[PDB]
Amino acid sequence: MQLTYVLILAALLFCIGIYGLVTSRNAVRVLMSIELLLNAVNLNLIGFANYLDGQQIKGQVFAVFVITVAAAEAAVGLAIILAIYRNRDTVDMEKFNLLKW
Amino acid sequence: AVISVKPILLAMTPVFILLCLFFGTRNGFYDTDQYHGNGSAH
């Protein structure tokens, strides 16, 4: 296990969440794909901290704050899902296109 | 021998000013018939 195999794993996890960002039709699967992106930048970061400058781990501190923001981006994000669902009684990303042009 | 513009412009300026203030008071047709009304060229 080298540094290179971690970043390819993080880059592959980035493009799986990228594919889930554009192809998902349920609004909650889009938020679940956002957590795939924010764990891609954490898997990229601890691998950057384990192999580069591991004495003073500055990536693992920075990997903590991404976990905290994505915890607050999902709590804010799911309150947005529950706000649309009370008015528009579906969760369907092909049905929210009323602010088109 | 050239007729200079400054003494005849300075002499015609107070004649020009007090006639604009006088001829505004004396006017017709813009207060009695006035079918143009508000819109001055509609």
Binding site: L21, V22, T23, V30, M93, F96, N97, K100, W101 | -
Partner: protein, 53 residues
Amino acid sequence: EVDYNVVDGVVNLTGFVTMVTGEGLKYLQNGRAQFYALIVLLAVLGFVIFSVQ
């Protein structure tokens, strides 16, 4: 009539190909925020080939 139609037609065409330009890029946005995320991710792929050479 060469004034009102020919050299006035060029002036009323600069204001016509700009009004129908803004009514063509008005359709660039269509809702469906997945498509908005597509243009964000495509322009990332554009600028990494455009700027490496």
